[PDB]
Amino acid sequence: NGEPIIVPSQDVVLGLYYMTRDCVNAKGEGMVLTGPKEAERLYRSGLAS
Amino acid sequence: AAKKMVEREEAVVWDILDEVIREHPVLLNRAPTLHRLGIQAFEPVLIEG
Amino acid sequence: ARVTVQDAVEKIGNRFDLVLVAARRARQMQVGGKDPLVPEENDKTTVIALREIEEGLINNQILDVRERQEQQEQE
Amino acid sequence: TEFLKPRLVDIEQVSSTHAKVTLEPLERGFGHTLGNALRRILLSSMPGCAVTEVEIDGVLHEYSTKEGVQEDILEILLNLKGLAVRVQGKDEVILTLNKSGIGPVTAADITHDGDVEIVKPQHVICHLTDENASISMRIKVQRGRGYVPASTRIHSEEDERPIGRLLVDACYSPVERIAYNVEAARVEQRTDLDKLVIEMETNGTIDPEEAIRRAATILAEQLEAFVD
Amino acid sequence: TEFLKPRLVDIEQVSSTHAKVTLEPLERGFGHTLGNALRRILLSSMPGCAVTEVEIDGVLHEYSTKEGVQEDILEILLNLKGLAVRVQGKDEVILTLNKSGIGPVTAADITHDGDVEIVKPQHVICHLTDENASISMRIKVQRGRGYVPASTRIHSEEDERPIGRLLVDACYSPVERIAYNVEAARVEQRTDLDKLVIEMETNGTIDPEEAIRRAATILAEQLEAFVDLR
């Protein structure tokens, strides 16, 4: 079937699910960011979950 | 002399192996090779172990 | 082509003709000692021939007229 | 009992604001030590200056709207936060920009003093729809270190500022992203070593190796007390 | 640049082995950085002396036995691998243990020299049961770091091995457990400072301020490659 066989499987999947899911009012919600670089700087600094 | 130089395992033999391996693939078969993608060829990297 | 040869596939048209012409070129480099026209950056003859075809200094009929040309200037 | 000193083998300079400091070889489990120490210092401790407060006419809080502009004041706040300024002598400079006419307003349009300058004059601020629209903002620049956001800024402040003052996140530290890997290098007998690959992308006002050297000498002068 | 510098202010010894140490004052955010860096260095790279070669008389290989003792020779080699020695001057010494008579063989029975100090006088090794039994082993104590095992040392040894030099694995690191805490510092004019409370657990042979000084020098000389060259 033309559907790819290199699919992430169970651990990459748990990690990407935990990345792209969202809570309601966790930490520093409602901020405005220039982009992914500033957002990842925020997360690695710990000021926003 | 080549046989005994390999069976003595010198550092020149380790360097020569590191040069031989470079972009020369190997086929990692797994049996039971049921479907077509049970044989795939990878460019090996050297590890101990 | 050192990770994916799909550029050489688009250059040739077919995987089997890619393997055959690259094998022809690699045999010419290992037997005849002809110079690889791309800088080699310490690589083997197969990936060098794939990189040659991937750049575009060699196709099947290009190698054919090249071998015929060196044949007629040899004879 | 002698340790392996490395050689800095590569600065692959991708752009003027990009680097990749390939670095090899270190003792087993030292690449993570150096990388994590430099990363935390470069994130939350490196000194520098940027815009903190701005007073704009026509607005009363962060959710109003001035005329003559396509973008809104959240967008002017965000594009203001993206501006990288450097202050040489003082540490609390207020700047004021006024723009009228058909066209976008860029960073070169600002009025500057002798002590301040713009590292990217073509960095956009906003755009203007009306030729009669006269935008005006009083841009204050403090100088701190690291990152302090407007949320805990408004939690920490208590004095009643005049209506029209706007808070923004203070990107004091000049780096935008640092993220490393640790790969595995080989000295001819021991394969257990490890090679550092530090990636770094900054704004203007600095050269990534200058930021790395600054963080390293910050940590060395911090640990300078109890050594031999 | 409004930074400060820390000092070792109070060094309390809870016991001879388990001992905490403060650090004061640290800047804002630096606490977890210095704590994790000193943890990784203090667990990986400390120098400590350990048992390397054990030479018992009349015993060929380590899987034999001997009449008179209770613990077998592999048990003796394990109980000797747990030993905690502190030498001062040399980097390679040879001790001697000779004892006869019914009763256990402590570590306090080793006829020690002047510059070696055995810091565990209740470390048991053997349990001599026969009064006509004797045991005369000659230990060899090197000094290094990390973990170097018997397989790699038999490969790397260029010298010959007489039958009797039993090779014991080398657990060189004398640090076993280390935890740091970032409290709130009690600074009379600053509230944004913190202290680092490193809680070491040593082998008894290493002095904690000396260990912290050596780990700090290791970190500084590693960072000099970043400081000087680019």
**What's the number of structural domains of chain C?**
1
Quaternary organisation of the protein chains = part of a larger assembly
Q: Please, how many helices of chain D?
A: 4
**Count of separate structural domains of chain D:** 2
Q: Give, in spatial order, the strands making up the sheet with the most strands of chain D.
A: 1-2-14-13
Largest interface: D-E, 42 and 41 residues
The ordered string of helix (H) and strand (E) elements of chain D is EEHEHEEEEEEEHEEEEH
CATH topology name of chain C: Eukaryotic RPB6 RNA polymerase subunit
Kindly report how far apart the N and C termini of chain D lie: 16 Å
Percent helix among the residues of chain C? 55-70%
Number of strands of chain D: 14
Radius of gyration of chain C: 12 Å
Write the CATH architecture name of chain C: Alpha-Beta Complex
Q: Give the overall form of chain C.
A: globular
Query: By CATH's scheme, which homologous superfamily of chain C applies?
Result: RNA polymerase subunit, RPB6/omega
Q: Helices and strands of chain C, in N-to-C order?
A: HHHH
CATH class of chain C: Alpha Beta
Number of helices of chain C: 4
Structural category of chain C: mainly alpha
CATH H-level name of the largest domain in chain D... which superfamily? DNA-directed RNA polymerase, insert domain
Task: Tell me roughly what share of residues is in helical segments of chain D.
Answer: 10-25%
What report would you give on this structure?
The structure is cut from a larger assembly and holds two copies of chain A (about 50 residues), one copy of chain C (about 80 residues) and two copies of chain D. Chain A has about 50 residues and is an all-alpha fold. Chain A is about 40% helix and about 0% strand. Chain C has one domain (about 1-75): Eukaryotic RPB6 RNA polymerase subunit, CATH 3.90.940. Chain C is globular, with a radius of gyration of 12 Å. Chain D has about 230 residues and is of the alpha+beta class. Chain D is about 20% helix and about 35% strand. Chain D contains four helices and 14 strands. The longest helix of chain D has 15 residues, at about 210-220. The two termini of chain D are about 15 Å apart. Chains in contact: A-D, B-C, B-D, D-E. The interface of D and E includes residues 3, 5, 23, 40 and 41 of D. Chain C: This is DNA-directed RNA polymerase subunit omega.
